[PDB]
Amino acid sequence: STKLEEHLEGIVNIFHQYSVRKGHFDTLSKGELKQLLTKELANTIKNIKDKAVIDEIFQGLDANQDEQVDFQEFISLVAIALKAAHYHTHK
Amino acid sequence: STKLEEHLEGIVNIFHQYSVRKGHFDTLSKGELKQLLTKELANTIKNIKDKAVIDEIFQGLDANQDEQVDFQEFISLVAIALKAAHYHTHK
Ligand code: NA
Structure with missing residues (x-):
């Protein structure tokens, strides 16, 4: 399985943990989803x-x-944030 | 960073390994893009x-x-593929 795949997995996993919890x-x-984000x-x-x-x-x-x-x-909202941050994920 | 944020970053990287050529x-x-996928x-x-x-x-x-x-x-195309594969990202 590919590098790109593994990260996709990572994000699916986290997402999945939230839904189940x-x-x-x-x-x-x-x-x-708001608390997730x-x-x-x-x-x-x-x-x-x-x-x-x-x-x-x-x-x-919040509205609904x-x-x-x-x-x-989910992922879509993750990406829109991502753009607005100029793809900087960092403290 | 965050497990998630660390994955996002890794992904953006892959994408840029491509975008940059x-x-x-x-x-x-x-x-x-088709080649990326x-x-x-x-x-x-x-x-x-x-x-x-x-x-x-x-x-x-191809058509464009x-x-x-x-x-x-990219990412939202990925999202589609993942969904269609019910999230199977291993051989
Ligand atoms: Na390019």
Whole structure:
């Protein structure tokens, strides 16, 4: 299995831990996507120069805390953050 | 960093190992993208039972091989492949 694959695995795993710990097997509520992100991308978030971006995401995650979401949704939000940070993941 | 953030970074790196080879430096042509996937998702791919999920994506990429896509495009294409392989990323 490839280098790229292994990291993808890593992220699936973490995502998967959250969903299971909070109820469902491969979806996780919005509410607890907000805590995921804020804990796990915290470095990255700090790095974002335009906070209006996560403010949104979040002012959106809070807005409907119970809707389950799947990894694809997850990863997508992870990436949007990622862009806003200019792909700096670092304290 | 964070396990997650460490994985993100590793991924961005792979992407840049690619992006950096031709043309513009933080993007690539879809033709290149198709090459990225063939090599770096190879088994996730050989692990997707519906052989049309990729096929179609690959068609899309051939049909406009010159068009430039960034990390976001990449990643969200990845997300699709992962989902189609129910997250099997080993041979
Ligand atoms: Na390039």
